[PDB]
Amino acid sequence: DDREDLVYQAKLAEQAERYDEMVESMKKVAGMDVELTVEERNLLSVAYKNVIGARRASWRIISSIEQKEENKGGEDKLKMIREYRQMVETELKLICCDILDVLDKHLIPAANTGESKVFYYKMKGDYHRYLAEFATGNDRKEAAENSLVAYKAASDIAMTELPPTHPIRLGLALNFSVFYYEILNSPDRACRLAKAAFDDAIAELDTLSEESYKDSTLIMQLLRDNLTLWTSDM
């Protein structure tokens, strides 16, 4: 019941939009070492996504301001921009390493079901990609290596265990395609994997469950929308 109490506190935190309290309540549930239910897996992800998201949204904004004041030549200000970015960067490093560790320690070893195994190996890839975004050089290269072997491990399981209509598999494809395009700067690969996951889905769209319908269609929409932008630039 102490576990159910924590899940409830996370839900109150979600609707209250206090996502710091959400990760904490859901962190204690991960450490419980029991395999998370589909509701708990979602809550944990929604929590750590919003908290890491907020910091990134800031990083990109101040990053653009750094490029603006780079041309202006206001050296006095450029120092403050960098100090503010390095402050936000350390936070991105902490939150990413927080969830990467509890994945490696509690969740990934515990997860036995094909669906759960994929969901986490994907999650690992995402937070290694988020480290790669701001990372510089041999720091970035290590984060990219980690990211790929995670997505690859997720993909190798997803191929046999999950069908192509499954939200988790499509979501993985999208993030792994976004990974290829942004991190590895290989658009030809990003477009293949995206077009592959998409065409595999529409082939068997008649099998898609009403439960998973809204989740997967949105993900498919976000695939074909990214495919349009990537192909029009080529």
Partner: peptide
């Protein structure tokens, strides 16, 4: 260039 990634799954 920022490109949309996997969103937050709907409740149930």
């Amino acid at each position: 260039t920022k490109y949309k990634s996997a969103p937050a799954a709907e409740k149930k």
